[PDB]
């Protein structure tokens, strides 16, 4: 029983050493440096398209590679693929289990995935010889529900389930190759790196980690939030990422220097955050709150510069295009709106 | 007009897609959807196996009775936190609940201080007073009664409930348990709790569920046109 006490003591002094090392490399915050830059005055964005047709809540949305096509998943069991320019639809792929919580789009435009509450990730094919849409593979190796899945390539997919684990799959063989463990709470959000070599996942107890795909371990850990993490996205540079939360606060961490930089919190908001996505040049940090409206939080000034309040219910998914031409938001009223 | 030759053919496809979506939206909206809950040894398996059956993770059971399609989701394999995946069950007609009367003298496994009846009461209080289920009624089932009588004939009820003055008879013990279960309902003017004792005849349980669903439908129709 004494060896456990010794191990706890060594772990505690390692945490103290890590804290002193993180304190030593800090000299001045980011807000003290960026006080000589002219900030943006007002970002007034008006709605352009209103894609309608769903009949239940909307839980996910992903933009295509050409920034023209997008896919949205709803609770009624549909996986509609919209057209951004002409509002037309291209497919109406049904689902087996009408309890979905995520969606994705292949970088080559061939496949489309959709997880759900039945802890099974289904992969669909869109370029078949016939005119329908078939199920290419059904991956099932998780215990808890799946929360988010991103296509690492045309043959490899990563999933983040609720049983405190993350795993990398293989579409051709059907079995998982590497499993990432270490989280104490249910992982419920992740985002791949721009260069597709690493990825981060946000736990459910005030924790965020950084994983590597080739080795399959954790490199660094980030903490500082109060309640939990609810949405993560990378900075376009690849050396930073902004994490959501539930206690009305989103922060911006750094990968090279494992320390917080700045926080975007106001005394008017007391509601959680659902989705976070950066901009084309990393200057606007869009955030979707659950008080029926969004925000256009500035990235380097921590000052609000716009409000996209044209929604009825809580927003659940939003993401900027690849070329930075428009943004799309989806709320629980089954109404997508393309802002520009 | 401005559209090209094959651009007018792409618009006709979207119309058919929307028509097929709207046709299926009015079919899956005329069937009753009801959730199922309970403890591990609360006899949920017995409840789902005794009733009419026509059909890891969530399990759906479909059965029809008197021109009504019921969908019963059995969320029993979800070991994750119940807080995150509970807001997707906001739109539901009723909420079945299964408890065990005889599970009041057996202390939990790997635990020597708390009982199962207290855990059932706590879970029922957490379900009834949630911020999402502030309008949906709750059907409450009493599964085991014969074994409960055989247990209370030998062991008194004072071991589980420290405050009890009635005699050691089932006719008033069941009523006392029911009255203790109804008191854990803060929202007394927005939802009702239907108490039933599970019998060996499954037709009785099916009829009780059908009658509760009919009552809920009548109340919702009265609240629809603002008539009361």
């Amino acid at each position, epitope marked *: 029983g004494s060896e456990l006490d010794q191990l706890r003591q060594e772990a505690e002094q390692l945490k103290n050493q890590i804290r002193d090392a993180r304190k030593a490399c800090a000299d001045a915050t980011l807000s003290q440096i960026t006080n000589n830059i002219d900030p943006v005055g007002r970002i007034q964005m008006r709605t352009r398209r209103t894609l309608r047709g769903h009949l239940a809540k909307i839980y996910a949305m992903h933009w295509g590679t050409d920034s023209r096509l997008l896919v949205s998943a709803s609770q009624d069991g549909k996986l509609i693929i919209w057209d951004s320019y002409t509002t037309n639809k*291209v497919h109406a792929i049904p689902l087996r289990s009408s309890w979905v919580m995520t969606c994705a789009y292949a970088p080559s435009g061939n496949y489309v995935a959709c997880g759900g509450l039945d802890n099974i990730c289904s992969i669909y094919n869109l370029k078949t*010889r*016939e005119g*329908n849409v078939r199920v290419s593979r059904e991956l099932a190796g998780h215990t808890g529900y799946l929360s988010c899945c991103r296509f690492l390539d045309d043959n490899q997919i990563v999933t983040s389930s609720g049983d405190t684990t993350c795993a990398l799959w293989d579409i051709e063989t059907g079995q998982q190759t590497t499993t990432f463990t270490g989280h104490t709470g249910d992982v419920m959000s992740l985002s791949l790196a721009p260069d597709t070599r690493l990825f981060v996942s946000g736990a459910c107890d005030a924790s965020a980690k950084l994983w590597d795909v080739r080795e399959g371990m954790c490199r660094q850990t980030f903490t500082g939030h109060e309640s939990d993490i609810n949405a993560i996205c990378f900075f376009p540079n690849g050396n930073a990422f902004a994490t959501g939360s539930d206690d009305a606060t989103c922060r911006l961490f750094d990968l090279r220097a494992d320390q917080e930089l700045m926080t975007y919190s106001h005394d008017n908001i007391i509601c959680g955050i659902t989705s976070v996505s950066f901009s084309k040049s990393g200057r606007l940090l869009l955030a979707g709150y659950d008080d029926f409206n969004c925000n256009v939080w500035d990235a380097l000034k921590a000052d609000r510069a716009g409000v996209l309040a044209g929604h009825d219910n809580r927003v659940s998914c939003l993401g900027v295009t690849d070329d930075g031409m428009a943004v799309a938001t989806g709320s629980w009223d089954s109404f997508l709106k393309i802002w520009n | 007009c401005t559209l*090209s*030759a*094959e651009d007018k053919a792409a618009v006709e496809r979207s119309k*058919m897609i929307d028509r097929n979506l709207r046709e299926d939206g009015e079919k899956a909206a005329r069937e009753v959807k009801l959730l199922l809950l309970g403890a591990g040894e609360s006899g949920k398996s017995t409840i789902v196996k005794q009733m009419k059956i026509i059909h890891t993770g969530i399990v759906e059971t479909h059965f029809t009775f008197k021109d009504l399609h019921f969908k019963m989701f059995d969320v029993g394999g979800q070991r994750s936190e119940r807080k995150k995946w509970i807001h997707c069950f906001e739109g539901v007609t009723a909420i079945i609940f299964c408890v065990a009367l005889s599970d009041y003298d057996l202390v939990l496994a790997e635990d020597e201080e708390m009982n199962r009846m207290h855990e059932s009461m706590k879970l029922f209080d957490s379900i009834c007073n949630n911020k999402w289920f502030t309008d949906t009624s709750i059907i409450l089932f009493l599964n085991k009664k014969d074994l409960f009588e055989e247990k209370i004939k030998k062991s008194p009820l004072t071991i589980c409930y420290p405050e009890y003055a009635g005699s050691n008879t089932y006719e008033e013990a069941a009523a006392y348990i029911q009255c203790q279960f109804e008191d854990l309902n803060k929202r007394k003017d927005t939802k009702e709790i239907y108490t039933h004792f599970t019998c060996a005849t499954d037709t009785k349980n099916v009829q009780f569920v059908f009658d509760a669903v009919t009552d809920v439908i009548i109340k919702n129709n009265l609240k629809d046109c603002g008539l009361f």
Partner: single-chain antibody
Amino acid sequence: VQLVESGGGLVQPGGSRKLSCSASGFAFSSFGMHWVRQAPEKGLEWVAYISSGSGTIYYADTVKGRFTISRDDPKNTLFLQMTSLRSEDTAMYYCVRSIYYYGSSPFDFWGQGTTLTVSSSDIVMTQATSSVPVTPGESVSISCRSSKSLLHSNGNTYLYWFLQRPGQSPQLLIYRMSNLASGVPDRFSGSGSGTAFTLTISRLEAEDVGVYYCMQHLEYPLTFGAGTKLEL
């Protein structure tokens, strides 16, 4: 995928038979179907068209109101019936499927075709030549000229191209402007400006010989070219 046709033979003017095709191997209820005539030793021309669900039906300007056409989804069969018959319809008939959405390839699978013998404003697409001699292992340039700028306000042209093999039905090569079809090698390529269109081939083998055709799909009265033949 498979497309077979039947119902052809020798008839007399005044009466006619009904042509039927059977489709099996895909979702026939979501595919638009065409009918392309093919005169013997001449050019092929469009005849009719049916959208998905019999919504829109377009006919040729020569046989408008004379032929009746209809689909059958539960049995997967497409019928064509002629009311009045003349001495010109003696030709080969091909029924070709086509689905229209963003990124699709119209009339990719043609079929086999059936024969028929009878005992007795619009865009004009012209070809540059009729038959040229060529040696294996040489780049060839085929040009097809139009009478109107096919470039639409969307930004993409609507000039389709395919190769007619000797003895069987043709197969698509590039559909919209230059996008290569599926299954054909990367040796074929095309380009243009909007009025004068051209097609180039990198390597010429002994397996790709026949008659080349260029199609105009900017307006629903479709029309083809005279057809240039490749001589080995």
